[PDB]
Design a protein around this ligand. Structure first.
Ligand SMILES: [Fe+3]
Ligand SMILES: [Fe+3]
Ligand SMILES: [Fe+3]
Lengths: 140, 139
């Protein structure tokens, strides 16, 4: 638990959590590509492996509960804590991250990617708003 | 304008990492809600997680033009995807997880060291299954 704070192992858990999260997403993408190809056994293999990566990421997050949410630095655990962290993250995404990435895409000559980032800014704003209403009505 | 070597390429990789993590985080939060009996909050975290799956999917579609953010290798076809997955998993079981276990043991986190060692063994097994699948792929 707490002796983790400020260690290299803390940073390794965060890195491994990021890698495992991405591995799940990547393997599900690969599974859908296998679906389209009619490669049903390969698809099923990707999905089974992706499920293993979910368990791995879950374990990393269990350990990180001692130090804070890797996306925000905020405590996590209870639903009130979780909503507060998700709100903070989402708010940062819609106010700064995606609009900044949109502007840069546009200025580099990637109009469609800029429009995509703007679509995502709108999406995260809707997430942040829904989470806030949920927290506002929470009875714990 | 070429995506390869652009600031936008790097931003798509970063955004992909963020979106991937957001889905894992929100699913974890959904399980905490389930245990507390906050079933409406659980459903909101799951719904939101599904949105983040879409976002990650779209970032990956753009990154197909440049390479797999985990390995730098091409992806698209099952042959390419297996090859990339094998390369990533091999890095994790030979280098990443053993390095992390050594640091954890050195810092006195013995349980965590063993966790990373267990994961190294799991990724080796992943690599081996993907290699078998690639070997018999009808392509
Ligand atoms: Fe894993
Ligand atoms: Fe969101
Ligand atoms: Fe998102």
């Amino acid at each position: 638990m707490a002796q983790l704070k400020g260690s290299k192992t803390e940073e390794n858990l965060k890195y491994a959590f990021a890698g495992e999260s991405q591995a799940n997403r990547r393997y599900l993408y690969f599974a859908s590509k296998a679906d389209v190809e009619g490669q049903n056994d390969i698809a099923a293999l990707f999905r089974s492996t992706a499920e293993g990566e979910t368990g791995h990421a879950h374990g990393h997050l269990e350990y990180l509960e001692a130090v804070g949410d890797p996306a925000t630095g905020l405590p996590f655990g209870t639903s009130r804590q979780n909503l507060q962290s998700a709100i903070a993250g989402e708010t940062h995404e819609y106010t700064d991250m995606y609009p900044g990435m949109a502007k840069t895409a546009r200025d580099e000559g990637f109009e469609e990617i800029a429009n995509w980032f703007e679509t995502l800014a709108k999406a995260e704003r809707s997430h942040a708003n829904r989470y806030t209403k949920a927290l506002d009505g929470l009875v714990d």
